[PDB]
Amino acid sequence: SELLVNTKSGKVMGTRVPVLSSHISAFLGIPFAEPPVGNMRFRRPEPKKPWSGVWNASTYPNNCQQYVDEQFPGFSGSEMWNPNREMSEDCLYLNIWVPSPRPKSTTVMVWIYGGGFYSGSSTLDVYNGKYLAYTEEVVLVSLSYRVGAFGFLALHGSQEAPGNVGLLDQRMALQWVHDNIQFFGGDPKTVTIFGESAGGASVGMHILSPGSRDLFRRAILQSGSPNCPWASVSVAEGRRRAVELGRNLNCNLNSDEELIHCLREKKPQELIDVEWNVLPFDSIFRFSFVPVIDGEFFPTSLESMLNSGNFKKTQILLGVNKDEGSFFLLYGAPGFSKDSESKISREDFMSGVKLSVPHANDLGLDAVTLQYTDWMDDNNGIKNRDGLDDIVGDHNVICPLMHFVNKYTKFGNGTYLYFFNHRASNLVWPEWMGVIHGYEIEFVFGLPLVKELNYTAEEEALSRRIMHYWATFAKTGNPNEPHSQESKWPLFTTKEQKFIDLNTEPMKVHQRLRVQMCVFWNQFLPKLLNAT
Amino acid sequence: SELLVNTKSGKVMGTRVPVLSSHISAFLGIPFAEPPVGNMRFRRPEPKKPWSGVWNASTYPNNCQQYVDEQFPGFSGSEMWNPNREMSEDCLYLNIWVPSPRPKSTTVMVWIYGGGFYSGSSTLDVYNGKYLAYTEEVVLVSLSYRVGAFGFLALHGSQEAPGNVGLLDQRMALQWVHDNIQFFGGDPKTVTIFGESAGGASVGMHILSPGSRDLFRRAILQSGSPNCPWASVSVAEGRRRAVELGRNLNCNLNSDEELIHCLREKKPQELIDVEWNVLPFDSIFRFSFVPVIDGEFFPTSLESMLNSGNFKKTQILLGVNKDEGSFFLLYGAPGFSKDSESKISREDFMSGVKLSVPHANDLGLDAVTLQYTDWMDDNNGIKNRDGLDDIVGDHNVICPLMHFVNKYTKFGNGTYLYFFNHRASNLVWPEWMGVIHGYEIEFVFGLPLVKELNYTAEEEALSRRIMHYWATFAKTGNPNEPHSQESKWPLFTTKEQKFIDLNTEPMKVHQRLRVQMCVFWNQFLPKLLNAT
Ligand SMILES: *[C@@H]1O[C@H](CO)[C@@H](O[C@@H]2O[C@H](CO)[C@@H](O)[C@H](O)[C@H]2NC(C)=O)[C@H](O)[C@H]1NC(C)=O
Ligand SMILES: *[C@@H]1O[C@H](CO)[C@@H](O[C@@H]2O[C@H](CO)[C@@H](O)[C@H](O)[C@H]2NC(C)=O)[C@H](O)[C@H]1NC(C)=O
Ligand SMILES: *[C@H]1O[C@H](CO)[C@@H](O)[C@H](O)[C@H]1NC(C)=O
Ligand SMILES: *[C@H]1O[C@H](CO)[C@@H](O)[C@H](O)[C@H]1NC(C)=O
């Protein structure tokens, strides 16, 4: 039967699903690790023991335990991001969409969700792989991984809560796809990993990590890179936060053994309820439990790995959205609200700058404020709001990514860079937020092809182009069709540094993406904060 | 007789001179101090002892001893600035142009020449006062003062070479005008002092100095202010340079008495020949012997006098030229030449930055380089040349002056600000130098009214407007005619900060003159260099 597949872990039975007046197969909720519960909470994941009988893979699995956004109850803009299934620590599952009839050996794409390493679900409506699987004839896989303290509590040295176990969950699933995707018609020698925000930084981390590089062929990173300032912490800071977590739950703190045992006795929600209290600063765009630079998963510092070429050499395709900072300002900077235009006063601007660059001394804050202030019109509320947006996006996403691409391109085998700047016509968030991070995802997964979702015709066309760029890059390592007549997305090179805009207008090619601001964030400010 | 005037120092006899098909009186070379020669070299000036008989005031006096620019032998662009009379330490004289018939009590304007405190002459063709005296019916006075070591060698504590004696020479002449200008038809209760570059910083210094403020009514400052970085040094640096001067002449250095005696035995040119060897850094726009912050002429630091309102409160009119830095780059930065367009390479840019901001550590040089570099087009030779021009002009003239006007306006009685950006059609310097500092002077003294000089008609008109703005401001404290129909030069205010452009086009009013760059030079960089 077409819905029955025999894998090395056992038999699995999918389900037929409709998609754009046709059908394909879906194998939802396939287990790839033993449930990380009880004594295994915080531990490295173990492989799933093979099973007898047929695994029913017809419904979505539980989503991992996470903080849930209740900031706007009933607003779809925020709720489309929340877990849409029961939460549970038994959550390590993957989903596969397979063209019908079953391919024999086609290109595979594995999606890694974002969510700041503290949240995220593989089952969100915007992550539904049937449109891309069907339109580009690829086998689409979405995986899951532990988030929050469950995925990233780190007490370096202890083997019970070593840290990075959330990254090892992603890795185990990549191992399972390597070992079994052939039975679903996928070609294991052609898998592309891709993801957004923390999913994009994760992708960059498997490119760096020696233990992960052999499990995939190519990579796509959307608004995230491994060197982002919010994506990793030192073993010492990881340790400090784990102890503070324990102190918030009245744990015995005399040894790692004692702390870990107390944390393992707590219900999931007791951990989620105090998670945010461990941040070292009053900050924006900073998350509590994130990957740790441990000497194992990452052999040395990220920057020294980048400089020395210590990473997988292959082709990459990556980019960012125009307004990366707005979500974070809305939720945590003063003067911003969902239902107003959020014109910012000079006081609120300064407050925002301090929140955006937590680790900066006063000279540093003055350097940032001067770089983004138009002194001929310093009380322009819209300019202050947009300047803050840019400060957050450049410091947290764009410049870190630009630094990664320039370092990578030096040893890589081909880089394609984009700047996504089309705001969706049906976005429910206010206009002032612009092209919000994550809102390029619906176009990558092809939602504009379904009429009832209400996109425009040009939006459906943009979706088809991005899907085909992503799937052609995955199959061949180049997003362009060989002899097509369409205009070409040029390769990004150390010298010319070209990139393309991605929107409903005719492709325009540019050079040196936000160079002015990125020389400030990647060269000057680090130098200013180190000397001073 | 109209050419004979009896002053308190004695009788003086002028000469009738033609001017634009008419005539006026000129009293050239009137002595206002005893010759500062021999033992009086470096000493404060003494009043000129009254004389019997008639002082022949029909020819220009000697110019003070100074370094002479031989960088372009025979080129008029540089030679029109060189001494045009025999040099001599007997040089303290003043010149007066008086309307005919002799006024009874008219507005007086006293010109103080620039020249970096190391050079300058009151007798230059561009400083000829007959055109302004005649056209605006004012009594025009030009004074002289010791420059170089002769005017500014400073060994604070010793009464033989105290420093600032060049400033006291200007002051003595202002005293003589206060006491005698009435006999020439001038009104001593209405004298305006005005000057350019070091002459403009001098004017600002008499506004600050308690011993000078009662000798004049109003002030005009052209491309210079007292707080400029090249206009003063501490008593300790003054001292260091005086000792180094002595060491370059093999002087006995055991006491001030010994050093001073050796320096007094040297011929003038032995001093001028080694003058430049005492600079502490490889620099541009820095001069050896300049005013010293001594606790007498300046009671406390300039910035604390400015902050506390410790200065003469009156009306001021001041401004700058568009391309203040070009002269200094031409003469001392690498890659610039008189007969080429001077496109600058990135190496030469960086060399120039280091020369322009001598006192800066590496982080500081990086801060300047980032602020003036267009990172999307960093090898643009013209952009590098123009950026260097701006760096020199903003740091040395424009921003210091902008800081002075904002501090002054808070306690003053009226400020008028201009931005002169018309390049003269007959300029012999190359195009790349732009509106060169000092080339607004010919328009202030009215040279475009004499046909044989070859200016355009619109240039003659601009000259007439500037002459009338300067002379009306001098007479009334406002450059505008009461009920004229001409557009108005608005007052500069703490809040609106308005200024006007000054050129051959219809007057345009603007606000916050080079604010972006000046917040960098007046607020951020000083803060960066103090912390680091
Ligand atoms: C990616 O790698 C391939 C092969 O490793 C590069 O192609 C080789 O290019 C060199 C120099 O141009 C030739 O000597 C070889 O004959 C090529 N080999 C093959 C199989 O084509 C290719 O240039 C690389 N691409 C990038 C963008 O670096
Ligand atoms: C310059 O000073 C004069 C007088 O010191 C100012 O005029 C006075 O203004 C105050 C308040 O407007 C009035 O009470 C007086 O009657 C005015 N006196 C005279 C003689 O007019 C004038 O405003 C000042 N100008 C500036 C630009 O500060
Ligand atoms: C497993 O899938 C769902 C479970 O909710 C349901 O159709 C049925 O219980 C199972 N299907 C089969 C074929 O066992
Ligand atoms: C003084 O002026 C010049 C000196 O060069 C000359 O005309 C003459 O010697 C003198 N004139 C008078 C009237 O004494």
From Swiss-Prot, chains A, B:
Inhibited by substrate concentrations above 0.5 mM. Changing S197V: Loss of activity. Its EC number is 3.1.1.7. It is an enzyme of class 3 (hydrolase). GO terms for biological process: acetylcholine catabolic process in synaptic cleft; choline metabolic process. Glycans are attached at N56, N413, N454, N530. The keyword Signal applies. The active site is at S197, E324, H437. Isoform H form is a homodimer; the asymmetric form is a disulfide-bonded oligomer composed of a collagenic subunit (Q) and a variable number of T catalytic subunits. PANTHER family: ACETYLCHOLINESTERASE. This is Acetylcholinesterase.
